[PDB]
């Protein structure tokens, strides 16, 4: 490419990072943060 330093409108490097999300049979390794709450049993509740 070359990417002339000052010149590129279209010509500049766009560092592109792409995150691909994969879910499998297995347990999640990467998960969202904080909120392990007390599990409640025998009651209608929303659960995640």
């Amino acid at each position: 490419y070359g990417f002339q330093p000052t010149n590129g409108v279209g010509y500049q490097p766009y560092r592109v990072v792409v995150l691909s999300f994969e879910l499998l049979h297995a347990p999640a390794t990467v998960c969202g943060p904080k909120k392990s709450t007390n599990l409640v049993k025998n009651k209608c509740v929303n659960f995640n």
């Binding site: 499998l24 049979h25 297995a26 347990p27």
Partner: protein, 36 residues
């Protein structure tokens, strides 16, 4: 020489637990009655 690998080579296709159900899946398996 070859021997008859009658049934063997089946494994759980996934991590998921299932019970009392007949499930169909497609993976790479050893075909039945194949020569080994």
């Amino acid at each position: 020489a070859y021997t008859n690998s009658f049934t063997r080579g089946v494994y759980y296709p996934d991590k998921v637990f299932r019970s009392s159900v007949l499930h169909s899946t497609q993976d790479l398996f050893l075909p039945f009655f194949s020569n080994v």
